[PDB]
Amino acid sequence: PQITLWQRPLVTIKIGGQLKEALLDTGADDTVLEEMSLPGRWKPKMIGGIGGFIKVRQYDQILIEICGHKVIGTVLVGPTPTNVIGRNLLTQIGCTLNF
Amino acid sequence: PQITLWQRPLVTIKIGGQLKEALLDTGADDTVLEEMSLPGRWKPKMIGGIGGFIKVRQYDQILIEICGHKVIGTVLVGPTPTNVIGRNLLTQIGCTLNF
Numbered sequence: 182p183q184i185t186l187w188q189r190p191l192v193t194i195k196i197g198g199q200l201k202e203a204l205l206d207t208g209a210d211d212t213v214l215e216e217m218s219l220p221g222r223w224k225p226k227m228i229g230g231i232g233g234f235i236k237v238r239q240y241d242q243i244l245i246e247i248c249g250h251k252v253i254g255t256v257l258v259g260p261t262p263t264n265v266i267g268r269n270l271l272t273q274i275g276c277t278l279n280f
Numbered sequence: 281p282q283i284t285l286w287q288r289p290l291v292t293i294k295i296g297g298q299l300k301e302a303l304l305d306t307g308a309d310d311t312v313l314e315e316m317s318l319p320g321r322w323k324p325k326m327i328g329g330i331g332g333f334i335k336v337r338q339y340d341q342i343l344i345e346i347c348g349h350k351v352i353g354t355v356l357v358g359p360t361p362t363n364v365i366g367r368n369l370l371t372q373i374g375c376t377l378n379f
């Protein structure tokens with residue numbers, strides 16, 4: 182519904198049959214998850230943030246359920262310290278910022 | 281206002297007499313600005329993100345105008361490729377995520 186930001190906006194996701202926690206990140210163009218097993222054909226990618234760059238595997242058309250909200254989109258998998266849900270999926274769940 | 285996320289949520293800020301653009305980032309605990317002179321006392325800090333860690337200068341009690349909303353808070357200055365407004369200031373403008 183509506184989430185304040187006094188604490189990290191952590192949500193439960195279900196992806197690839199697995200339950201995880203992930204951060205809702207409006208600062209992220211892309212969705213980036215810690216190393217995991219995704220079936221299908223991926224492509225090598227490199228992405229950047231504060232600190233520098235990492236290599237990821239780009240998985241397209243992956244089902245993920247965010248707060249029980251089904252979305253299908255690209256997920257990058259690689260050596261990120263946390264699971265980040267980026268704008269590519271935040272748009273599909275109709276997410277906005279408000280103030 | 282309400283801001284969708286089809287595009288990066290970039291906003292105009294006024295800080296230290298200067299106008300800049302910055303990213304509203306719910307994934308950021310802290311507010312991190314590219315190099316800039318700020319007056320007064322500051323403390324050394326390290327912060328991390330997707331690719332690694334950086335050294336920043338921490339400034340407290342700094343006035344920032346974000347979309348015409350004045351807030352006073354801590355601002356980190358350092359080698360970030362982008363100006364990021366983090367939750368420490370997003371809360372002060374009463375910002376929420378909604379879906």
Ligand SMILES: CC(C)(C)OC(=O)N[C@@H](Cc1ccccc1)[C@H](O)CN[C@@H](Cc1ccccc1)C(=O)N[C@@H](CCC(=O)O)C(=O)N[C@@H](Cc1ccccc1)C(N)=O
Pocket residue numbers: 204206208209210211212213228229230231261262263265267305307308309310311312326327328329330360361362364366
């Ligand atoms: C993830 C991709 C798609 C590659 O995009 C970004 O990294 N976008 C960044 C925007 C940007 C663009 C250009 C240049 C620089 C930055 C966001 O800030 C990403 N948001 C989160 C994603 C994240 C969260 C947690 C872990 C890893 C990555 C972030 O870095 N947040 C930082 C922002 C810096 C800050 O707030 O101080 C954070 O909260 N860092 C914490 C937590 C932390 C600790 C240790 C390692 C990593 C993170 C910290 N206290 O250092």
Ligand SMILES: [Cl-]
Pocket residue numbers: 253254255269270
């Ligand atoms: Cl996508």
Ligand code: NA
Pocket residue numbers: 210211212255256269
């Ligand atoms: Na993407």
